[PDB]
Amino acid sequence: SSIGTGYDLSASTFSPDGRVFQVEYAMKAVENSSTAIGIRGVVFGVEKLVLSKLYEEGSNKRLFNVDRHVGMAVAGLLADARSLADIAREEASNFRSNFGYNIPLKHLADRVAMYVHAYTLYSAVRPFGCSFMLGSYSVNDGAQLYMIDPSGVSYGYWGCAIGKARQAAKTEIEKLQMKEMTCRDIVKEVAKIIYIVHDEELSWVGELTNGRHEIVPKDIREEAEKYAKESLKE
Amino acid sequence: SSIGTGYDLSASTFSPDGRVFQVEYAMKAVENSSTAIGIRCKDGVVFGVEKLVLSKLYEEGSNKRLFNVDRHVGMAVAGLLADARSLADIAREEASNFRSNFGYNIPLKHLADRVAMYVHAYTLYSAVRPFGCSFMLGSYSVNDGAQLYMIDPSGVSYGYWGCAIGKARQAAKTEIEKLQMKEMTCRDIVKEVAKIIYIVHDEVKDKAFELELSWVGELTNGRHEIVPKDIREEAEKYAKESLKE
Amino acid sequence: SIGTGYDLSASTFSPDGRVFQVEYAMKAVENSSTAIGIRCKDGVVFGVEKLVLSKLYEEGSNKRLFNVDRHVGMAVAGLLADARSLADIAREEASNFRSNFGYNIPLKHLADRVAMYVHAYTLYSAVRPFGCSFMLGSYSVNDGAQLYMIDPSGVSYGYWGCAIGKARQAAKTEIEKLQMKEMTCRDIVKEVAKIIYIVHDEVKDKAFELELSWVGELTNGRHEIVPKDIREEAEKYAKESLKE
Amino acid sequence: SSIGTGYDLSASTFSPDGRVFQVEYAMKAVENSSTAIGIRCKDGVVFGVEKLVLSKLYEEGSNKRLFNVDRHVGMAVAGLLADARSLADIAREEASNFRSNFGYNIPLKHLADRVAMYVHAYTLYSAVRPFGCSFMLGSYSVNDGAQLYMIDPSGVSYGYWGCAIGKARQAAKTEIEKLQMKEMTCRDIVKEVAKIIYIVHDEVLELSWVGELTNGRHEIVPKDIREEAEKYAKESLKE
Amino acid sequence: SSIGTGYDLSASTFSPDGRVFQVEYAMKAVENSSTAIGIRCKDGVVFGVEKLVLSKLYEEGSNKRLFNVDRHVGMAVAGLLADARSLADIAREEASNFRSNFGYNIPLKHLADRVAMYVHAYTLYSAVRPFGCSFMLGSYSVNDGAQLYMIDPSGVSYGYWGCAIGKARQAAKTEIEKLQMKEMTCRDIVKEVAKIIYIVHDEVKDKAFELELSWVGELTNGRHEIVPKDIREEAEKYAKESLK
Amino acid sequence: SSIGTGYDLSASTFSPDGRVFQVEYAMKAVENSSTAIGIRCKDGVVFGVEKLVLSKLYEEGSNKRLFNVDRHVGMAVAGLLADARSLADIAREEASNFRSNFGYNIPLKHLADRVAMYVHAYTLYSAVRPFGCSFMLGSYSVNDGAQLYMIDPSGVSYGYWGCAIGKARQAAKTEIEKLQMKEMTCRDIVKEVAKIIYIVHDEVKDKAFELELSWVGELTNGRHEIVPKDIREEAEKYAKESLK
């Protein structure tokens, strides 16, 4: 089913068996990007491929803040993701203008999804070539993790995984007992699973950080990195 | 993978294996242009450009592939020059409609982020092609330090210690990997730039070439200036000499 | 002959990284007759290989040397309808200067603006780009003498002298010979009209007239046409140094 | 100089001796409101307000004459309260439509400058009156340090070490002149604030953090420290 | 201080001693209207209104000075009734153009804040007068608990444990100060309301009067309902009796 | 001529003897503000301001009656400060929406001309009052030399060698008439400024005062800077002494 004739050149075009091929292709732009995962506070990690030595450190970043209290973790076509981050930024801001406090992640996800989906109907554009996840903690709402794909679908999650191996990395998170564990524990078990899955970057948010989504300090990375390298040998 | 049928005539069109071919092609408009590079000393940033004397008849200070965007920001461009000049205008307005409101200079981080927004905007849609140019922005102030950014046709903003765009991307980047840029002063770097241009330049297939050069640092108050002719001719000479070898 | 697809829209990069529909627009300039412009030390001079396409014509129709302002002259090659429209754009642009800013427009900038504009037609599928190159030349005393050339792709180039059309190539190697930085404008008009006659194809093109342009300290800053004395005299000088 | 004929009914009307009376009157709407003050420690800024229990029936945390505008900015207001609350909304949006674009927090310098722009806008025109309120904005981060600003009805933004708006402006300012605010820590200051409220109050309290003390967050002052500082004021009063 | 000359004909006009008289006058439109009050039990909120039978000819459930704004929000109004009804509409839209987007119910805190924004908007300008009405909003859900707010003509939103607007503001508020509202259940309160209406009512100068009454609490799921006739007539009776 | 009836309440109203009184009144808003002056050396321009320490409690570098509008332009203001700050914003945008397009710095001639346009715009109409402030703009580059301009409420732009706005206009101007400003260097001038502030200042009726001071020249690259504290305190002292 390299279906396509015609059927796969526009988002404005259903295939006969009932499929918008140009979206599926947008999803395959996520597949060809490196793996990145997130798991419930909430923790994100990313298989960030040192494409060069010449880089800045803290360029590149595939873990954003959208707000103070929200983090974004992206996979696929990075230019697009950054623009979608901007959209989330505005959306969570034009909240606080009016409604006084922080935006609920449920809803912010719902909105930015609205937006992503908007690009799947029409012939004058292609859809976005990126998935991403949003993660937040406050105490009123608890811990929350969401994932949006190119087709514009917002999914709540206990943990998930996007990119090169989606598939491998998800079966590995199925193993863990995420509901129980503390955030401090998890960062290890993340970095494990990146290294497991990698074919031969890290993110807080929780009660652990006040509600602030921070980067993971270098102590804990290097230590958790090491723990991954070691439980690898096996 | 001359992929394309259909899949490579619009920016509105993903290939099946998940690729916007018309952007990649826009990137290959940068490749066919001459090399240009930029690189971050500890007290600032330096740009140089393999500027191919396409004629003798030219003005000097036409041609220029090193702009000021502001006083304190410099732009260094490669690929399709008409496009770049327009993108420069966009950066100009953006860094201006800053100072109107926000009072002082624009942060390079952000300006890059904005002009990137813009470049990316041309990658989604069928009624245009994307821009056929990469470029780099460099600034110094003392509060922010030295800063170097590179945007490509696909609209991605990258921070850098040094980078290189055009004919040899590839050769010129492996040569900057050698240098110890974090340490060195800007005054030193201008030499080591002009070396690498001359290293990488093709004597055979490209003809004669001039060389264009760019300051910004604590060395120049924060002002992005052109490099005075003393220092060019001297650094040019140093390149010619360490070439023979 | 790349093209399939790749060459029917300005909205379409070729795979090897090329907007073919612009290059084709440039080839509309090539098939037009030669025209050149060249910077003396006290000003700028334009000449045009204006092919008497008929005897029936008005004189001072046809004109491939415009005024855009008082102080700016335009010299065009390729698809003439387009050029005339671009002239209008330059006219407005240099005018909506003086409204506000009080004095004359700087050529640097005017060129930069009209270029902006030409380039605007190279990105999009609902139009083709302009099928014409042209040069702008001015003098004042504050700015000195200035010469610019814009091509279809929307690139503004400063120049000491340049040449657009049938032979670009021949006519440029001929201006390389001259010592333009030194010479006075009065001298140059000769050496122009020489080079038109040098380059002109006697065989394949038929008869031809010649059109000619001042601007310098020689003319106050005003871009004028070259008076008929100096044409017929410089025309003659070309005819003579031809025989050789 | 009850000047006015004509000269004092519009913001569109200069008096002959060169005065926009309708603004000065808007300032006198601040005077008739209760006192409120704010003052810059070395590690942050502190606000207090002579909040007159107009009733027992109230909510607690209604009424509030100390807002958050952002997380990191606090507002402290005096005069005509309906207006202030609307100006707070303006500040809110302004500091938000920052973070949308420019990525981080808004600089207080500038936010003040903006919201001032806005207040001044109401002073020129005949179809409106100007705002009947002064207010102060206070913030801390570490990059910018501690910062305190005051805008009045006429739309003027002033930086300050400490200031005071309302019933006694005048009394309360001469009292802050005494203190050594540049030196002191924020923890110390809250006392010396609440003192000065009680000094100035006519016999015949709400409180505000921001500093390194609170991460950069403008919080309300916890009840420990109020009741303790309140007590300290009551005591050094007797004298 | 019948101040006014000039100073009191526009909302665009500060008095010299620093006062927008035309708002204070709008507040005095509330005073000349009959009393109405609202008061926060621990499991919800209750409203009652001294509704003056201006005629026998009326519909019953015309007149109504207790609205629903939403399902879960109730409004209780005093002063100039035409205005109030329009402000209700504004609250209606505002709490609706919530649920469109944000999914669930509107928080009373905020809805009050918004509609206040709006009321205040009418206090600045010369081409209008402000609204001639106060009102109170009351809601319960379980997440937010019980909530009571009051907005006056000047556009100020106040949170409350209980309050009172109209003929006697003053009398009725001192009476609610007596009660222990934080403790009591909603079922208890409705009595103690209807008491205070009857206490405050002027037997001499006002004639006969009906009584209107309002639920919201855990008692009603979150729904603001009218108080069923059992409980009115029973609480009405209890008021009549503790009167004597 | 307290003329006014009618004639002096609107900018839309000529007096019968031919006068827009509401502008003249706007000018008298400048008079009641403290003095500030500016004066053109041969290598640049210098501003100083009789800045009345209205309190001890202030920030230092609040208050500022000397702005940067650009890097290369400085503004010095007198009268109604809220207005001035808004006019500064206008100048800021205007000199910015230059560099966007025209590539380099804005010419002071023109910037003044523009912002003036604007100030004048407020003198015709009944729905506004004009601005209650004068100000001066000063710049140096090498191409244009040193330049000093003053705009008053009526919207008139004036070039100057030196000028003075506020409490004593009059005193301070007769004092600058003394100096030989065309000759002198900027370094010299800052003294002679701060002299004239102190000369003119009223010791009786105004209390203490600070002093604010402003560079621009070849002395500072073209940058308008504040005057470093060395040179202030030293020039302040020189003023105090030649006072006695």
Author numbering:
A (entry chain C): 1 to 40, 44 to 203, 212 to 245
B (entry chain B): 1 to 245
C (entry chain A): 2 to 245
D (entry chain J): 1 to 204, 211 to 245
E (entry chain I), F (entry chain K): 1 to 244
Lines from the paper:
The proteasome, a huge protein complex responsible for ubiquitin-dependent proteolysis in eukaryotic cells, is composed of a 20S core particle, which serves as a proteolytic chamber, and one or two regulatory particles. The core particle consists of two α- and two β-rings, which form a cylindrical, four-layered αββα structure. The α-ring is composed of seven homologous but distinct subunits, α1–7, that are arranged into a hetero-heptameric structure in the order α1-α2-α3-α4-α5-α6-α7 with assistance of assembly chaperones. Among human proteasome α subunits, α7 exhibits a unique feature of in vitro self-assembly into a homo-tetradecamer with a double ring structure.
First, we determined the crystal structure of the human α7 tetradecamer at 3.75-Å resolution. The α7 tetradecamer exhibited an hourglass double-ring shape, which is consistent with the previously reported negative staining electron micrographs and small-angle neutron scattering (SANS) data. The two α rings interact with each other mainly through two α helices that are involved in β-subunit interaction in the 20S proteasome. The conformations of the individual protomers and their quaternary arrangement in each ring of the human α7 tetradecamer are essentially identical with those observed in the homo-heptameric α-ring in archaeal proteasomes and the hetero-heptameric α-ring in mammalian proteasomes. The SV-AUC data showed that the α7 subunit exclusively exists as a single species with a sedimentation coefficient of 14.2 S, which is in excellent agreement with that estimated from the crystal structure (14.4 S), confirming the double-ring structure of this complex in solution. The mass spectrum of α7 under non-denaturing conditions exhibited ion series indicating a complex with a molecular mass of 405,879 ± 81 Da. This confirms the homo-tetradecameric structure of this subunit (with a calculated mass of 28,284 Da, based on its amino acid sequence). Although a detailed comparison of the inter-subunit interaction modes was difficult because of the low resolution of the present crystal structure, the model clearly shows that α6 makes steric hindrances at the inter-subunit interface, thereby explaining why α6 is not able to form the homo-heptameric ring as α7 does. All these data indicate that α6 interacts with α7, disassembling one mole of the tetradecameric double-ring of α7 and thereby give rise to two moles of the 1:7 hetero-octameric α6–α7 complex. In summary, the present study demonstrates that the proteasome α6 subunit acts as a breaker of the α7 double-ring structure.
